Design a protein around this nucleic acid. Structure first.
Length: 89
DNA sequence: TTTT
């Protein structure tokens, strides 16, 4: 019934490195409110909603769930706008 | 699997 640290956010891919299997999202809104200061959120390839090889393209818009982690923040599931598949490279 |  509860998972209180899990929040919803939106933004765009800051960078993504397919050799390393991760990148960052620049989060520009959370919990339905735009942010005065964008926040980087780590994104691992395993979290990307899409078929085939998983990546994010620099600048593509994303919606996601995330949670604070030991090293920063962590994306938990990442989609395009409206829950459609991410585009990637 | 935490910086670009």
């Amino acid at each position: 019934g509860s998972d209180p640290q899990v929040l919803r956010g939106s933004g765009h891919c800051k960078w993504f490195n397919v050799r390393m299997g991760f990148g960052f999202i620049s989060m520009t809104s959370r919990e339905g409110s735009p942010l005065e200061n964008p926040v980087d959120v780590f994104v691992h390839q395993s979290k990307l909603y899409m078929e085939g090889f998983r990546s994010l393209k620099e600048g593509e818009p994303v919606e996601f769930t995330f949670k604070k982690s030991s090293k920063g923040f962590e994306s938990l599931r990442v989609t395009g706008p409206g829950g459609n598949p991410c585009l990637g490279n």
